[PDB]
Amino acid sequence: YEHTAVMPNKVGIPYKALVERPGYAPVHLQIQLVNTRIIPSTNLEYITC
Amino acid sequence: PTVSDLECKITECTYAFDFGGIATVAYKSSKAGNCPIHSPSGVAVIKEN
């Protein structure tokens, strides 16, 4: 079974969801960010000193 | 055992080709025992006998 939602982006605040599967006891899940590392694509031009 | 003071409560159901409905009954007995259950109407089929 799968579940979808939207979560606000913040490093510390966790996110608690409660999935429902009819004919079954509900289960809750807990997901928490640790990082968000944007990485750009770069190339060198020259150096100086 | 004589059966009286019945109360049937529907918990949850959903129409699908498998048994997707569950309901509960409260009851006041005369004495312990076993006797069958049945639905004469055809709107729903009873999984149990």
A-chain residues within 8 Å CB-CB of B12?
A: 22-23
Using left for φ > 0, alpha for ψ between -120 and 50, and beta otherwise, residue B44 falls in beta
Q: Tokens 């899940």 sit at which residue? A: A29
Could you tell me the two tokens for B16?
């699908």
Cβ of A22 within 8 Å of Cβ of B12? The answer is yes
Structure tokens, A24: 């079954």
Residue B21 identity: G
Residues of B in contact with A22 (CB under 8 A): 12, 14, 20
**How many contacts does A have with B, using Cβ atoms within 8 A?**
6
Measure the CA–CA gap between B37 and B48, rounded to whole angstroms: 8
